[PDB]
């Protein structure tokens, strides 16, 4: 269904705060922010989609995503809150795309 202004603003806000939380998690862990974003994205999408990312130096397989999710799970509370924020941010990005998929059709019919 289409979004009401409130739902739209809420989804966009969750996405932005999730990106910020991924940056903070890269600050804490010392890992690469792209690897962290890919692990969060994999866990939100599920094991149905796990493939190698070109920019990533490591072949993203469920064993490595489990290792990195364990490195993220072994964090204090005020640090693991960032992992929670990132997970919800990716989950919000998904629905933000899916909600506005209609606009793409209404624009592309003219090309």
């Amino acid at each position: 269904p289409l979004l009401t202004l409130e739902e739209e603003v809420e989804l966009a806000r969750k996405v932005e705060e999730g990106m910020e939380a991924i940056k903070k998690l890269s600050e804490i862990t010392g890992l690469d922010p792209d690897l962290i974003r890919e692990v969060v994205r994999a866990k939100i999408l599920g094991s149905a989609r796990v493939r190698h990312i070109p920019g990533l130096k490591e072949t993203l397989d469920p064993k490595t995503v489990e290792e990195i999710d364990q490195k993220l799970k072994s964090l204090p509370k005020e640090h693991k809150r960032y992992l929670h924020i990132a997970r919800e941010g990716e989950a919000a990005r998904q629905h933000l795309i899916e909600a506005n998929l209609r606009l793409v059709v209404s624009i592309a019919k003219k090309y």
Binding site: L5, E6, V9, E10, R13
Partner: protein, 52 residues
């Protein structure tokens, strides 16, 4: 309002009640679509704590 404790003094044909009262007063806040509530239902907040 509820009366926690009650101190009384007798003087003449009257009693003067010192009441240790405790009560709650409402203050409504309006939320706009660009605002988000950062506080759950029935949570306790102090002076300085963020609600919206």
């Amino acid at each position: 309002v509820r009366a926690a404790q009650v101190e009384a003094e007798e003087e003449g044909e009257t009693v003067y009640l010192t009441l240790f009262l405790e009560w709650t007063e409402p203050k409504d806040y309006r939320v706009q679509p660009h605002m988000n509530v950062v506080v759950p239902e029935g949570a306790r907040v102090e002076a300085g704590d963020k609600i919206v």
